[PDB]
Amino acid sequence: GLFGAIAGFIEGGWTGMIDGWYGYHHQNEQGSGYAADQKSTQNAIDGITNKVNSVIEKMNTQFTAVGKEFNNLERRIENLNKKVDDGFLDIWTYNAELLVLLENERTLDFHDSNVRNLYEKVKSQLKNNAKEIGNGCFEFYHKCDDACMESVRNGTYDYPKYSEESKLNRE
Amino acid sequence: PKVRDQAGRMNYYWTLLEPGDTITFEATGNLIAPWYAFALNRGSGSGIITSDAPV
Ligand SMILES: *[C@@H]1O[C@H](CO)[C@@H](O)[C@H](O)[C@H]1NC(C)=O
């Protein structure tokens, strides 16, 4: 993908996280588990829902609209009618197929972006108190219990609190 | 030539008579006279389709 994460440096998805599009898996002394990142998931859901709704919404309804009939000395106007209907059919078929193609690409790319940005967000919180594995995972140089983990997940991680300890294990 | 046994022909004509107006028929032959007519209320954007599907 454009942003290199999904089907990228993170090879695959997690069938074990059923409650969100994006999130975290942790393992520590207290136990192990998945937790969805609520904010990014909900932002993406709202965005994509707005996209679909906006595609559907722009088709102001067709009010009652019908085919025309013609007598045997009206072939030219009948053909004008057919030219109009066929022409509109060409335009709407091309536009619908191509639009769906391009927007599908954009949606997938949007997800890839959201994953990369969540990863870099966590990365920028943790800095050198953890080492990047490379597969989307971070390994702590300090003990990080459940409260600490949740602090990481909600962006309230306290770097100075664990910096000295981290520095101790890193060296 | 004959169609449905008849070498004669009949032409059919119609008109919409507006409210309050009068239509007058005069003839010395050949008139197929109105017997029943239809008073109409108008409405837009419909049309006719051909289908064998059940209503
Ligand atoms: C995030 O989690 C930490 C640790 O439990 C907590 O202290 C903090 O209040 C939480 N912040 C939010 C956004 O609720």
Give the termini separation of chain A.
37 Å
Count of strand segments of chain A: 4
Distance between the termini of chain B: 40 Å
Specify the number of helices of chain B.
0
Per the CATH scheme, the topology name of chain A is Hemagglutinin Ectodomain, Chain B
Helix content of chain A: 40-55%
Oligomer: part of a larger assembly
What shape does the CA trace of chain A take?
A: rod-shaped
Main interface by residue count: A-B, 7 and 6 residues
Number of helices of chain A: 4
What proportion of the residues of chain A form beta strands (DSSP E)? Answer: 5-15%
Give the tally of β-strands of chain B.
Answer: 0
Proper CATH architecture of chain A = Alpha-Beta Complex
The percentage helix of chain B is under 10%
Reading off the top of the CATH hierarchy, the class of chain A is best stated as: Alpha Beta
Which small-molecule ligands are present, each listed once? 2-acetamido-2-deoxy-beta-D-glucopyranose
Describe this entry's structure for a reader.
The structure is cut from a larger assembly and holds chains A (171 residues) and B (55 residues). A two-stranded antiparallel sheet of chain A has the order 1-2. In chain A, strands 3-4 form a two-stranded antiparallel ribbon. Chain A is rod-shaped, with a radius of gyration of 27 Å. With 171 residues, chain A is mainly alpha-helical. In chain A, 54% of the residues lie in helices and 11% in strands. Chain B is mostly loops. Chain B has no helices and no strands. The N and C termini of chain B lie far apart (40 Å). The chains are: A mainly alpha (171), B little secondary structure (55). At the A-B interface, loops of A face loops of B. Chain A: This is Hemagglutinin HA2 chain.
